[PDB]
Amino acid sequence: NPIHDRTSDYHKYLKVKQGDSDLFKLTVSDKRYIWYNPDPKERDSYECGEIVSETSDSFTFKTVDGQDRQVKKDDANQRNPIKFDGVEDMSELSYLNEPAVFHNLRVRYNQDLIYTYSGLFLVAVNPFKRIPIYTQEMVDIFKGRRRNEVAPHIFAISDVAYRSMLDDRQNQSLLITGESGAGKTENTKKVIQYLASVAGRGVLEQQILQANPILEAFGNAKTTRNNNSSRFGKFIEIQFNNAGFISGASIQSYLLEKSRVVFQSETERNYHIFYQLLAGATAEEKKALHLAGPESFNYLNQSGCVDIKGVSDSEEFKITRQAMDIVGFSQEEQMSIFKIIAGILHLGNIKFEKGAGEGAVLKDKTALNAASTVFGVNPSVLEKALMEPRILAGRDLVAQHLNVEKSSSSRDALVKALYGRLFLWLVKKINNVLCQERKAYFIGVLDISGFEIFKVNSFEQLCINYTNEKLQQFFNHHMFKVEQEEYLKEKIDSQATIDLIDGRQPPGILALLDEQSVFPNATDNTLITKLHSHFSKKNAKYEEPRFSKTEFGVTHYAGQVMYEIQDWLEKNKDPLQQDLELCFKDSSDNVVTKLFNDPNIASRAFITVAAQYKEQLASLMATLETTNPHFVRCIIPNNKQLPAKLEDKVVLDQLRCNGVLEGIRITRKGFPNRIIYADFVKRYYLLAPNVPRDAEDSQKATDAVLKHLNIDPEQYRFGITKIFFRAGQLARIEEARE
Ligand SMILES: Nc1ncnc2c1ncn2[C@@H]1O[C@H](COP(=O)(O)OP(=O)(O)OP(=O)(O)O)[C@@H](O)[C@H]1O
């Protein structure tokens, strides 16, 4: 029994090592410390300082250097007694300050303990190295175990959700968010792995599992923050029958980063699939596809990075091709997907030349003709449609000769649509396979980024941020109720931001954006002007910059984020020349024809991108609203992708943005420590005369100690089953003499 075998890997990897004694006495000391900022400028970097004295109003402590300082008791960040170092739930700490929180988190990480709870949340720190806690043997141990019974772990939250599902007959949700590279997908895959094991019986399970890899090849890429970043968000519905067995699955994708297909920053890569293809394609497939090295392609030859360390695109291509096979994609299907990938590479190879007049021309039909063949479309129609699209100018339909820039840009537009569309198609194709109309229950997993606050924030960041204001409010509401429940079981702000963004009347940012969208001739300037006009000095969550003329700022949950308006008009419309669609609709390819002839794929509805985003977010929320949710906050330890490197600033910032610290401060004001009578006595019986560790009237005994100690009744609160302590209370208690 691993949970009991102190020699087990379980103990080794998941628990703080346990000695031979329980004795309260070991932990005895007389020293008292505070967490202080040695450099007031750098407030997230703190040092421990012993309190050498005290006044009625302050504290006087000694620094590392032996430098004495004074602090207000109220501004003091007192350090919890050493015994608290490493607890599995921050909700267990007595002093709940920010430094204290990071500390516990750090003590744990120092021991390779990546999972820690914070009340309702499961905090997970990226180890940046392998930890063998995900083996089948690991899985088997979590089965049926209460949260309190076992150590913190993703498998643990997953078990709770499945048991709740079965016991409450209620659907469930796991929300996993955090920065790029923080480890979301990793945890996501574990949740599924675990579910499949605990509820599976396999063929479906297989196909389910195999879906991921497909999604990864097409929607994942190498960025500066992660070698395998998911450039899209997702919602995974794991379906079950009334018996508790997996019946199916459904996938919902969002915000795919199409842009990446025609452009990548230095060092980054295009989607993994491009490379897998280039590498593991048979030599006899290459020729059929007019393939070469990535170096030979405009879309792959520009970041100065075509491969990933510790990664074989060919080996991976095998992997992908297998999954497709398992899922059920016909060879013919597979072909076409590759052809598309191919065509896309060819399209980017097209060189627009425009010297003849002021309209572009094609001196070389090579690339062009390559695209056409693989697409199974006409080169002449493609050609025209690209540089001479007929545009409706009133009553007349006239073909316009496009310049070079415009020409290239349309070609790019074509490529992005191909991709985005193919992506949708795959998702669709997969759901068909695993998805159930008639399902009894479900467990859903949402994996997407948390707030994004980059150097430069564009339309996509507004969107993601918007989603996050909603998730945060959901958490907040959910937290409110359950807190009340518990306080009830025992005898014991985002609206404004959301409105500014999605409001109808008065119109919010998105409504103004849609409005400007109707006008062919509107510009970024008209748009940014309209926005300031309506909110500058008028809406409290908005800010007009002192000097930039292309940006505006939104005060979010996370804090202020400054956005830039470039291309928002275009992005909202996501325009594609009709001649283009025309061209592609006749496609000899059975896969191509769908992308264009299927209204479910080829069109949004009439609605704009923003309108579609709002809608999907609402359906999402709605659904979530019907489940019992679970929250996992994935934390990146540093920005270097290194182990044993947990940077306070890096960390603190995420804890502030993600709601963990907020949940704490809040709880901090209440009665944060809620202990079970038996457990209380066991550890502190010694504090009072006449109390045996094992006492049948735990509540009475509890009262004994408190009474003996002469604690202030305002500080503690008798619950039907637990004793509730205000902040600092347990600490001093702990700090008492045997
Ligand atoms: N528990 C873990 N054990 C080992 N490695 C991990 C763990 N969590 C994350 N990592 C590793 O760190 C890398 C980044 O993690 P992951 O891909 O899951 O992050 P992410 O949150 O999904 O990022 P993004 O938003 O860019 O897609 C991974 O390739 C992963 O292998």
Ligand SMILES: [Mg+2]
């Ligand atoms: Mg990811």
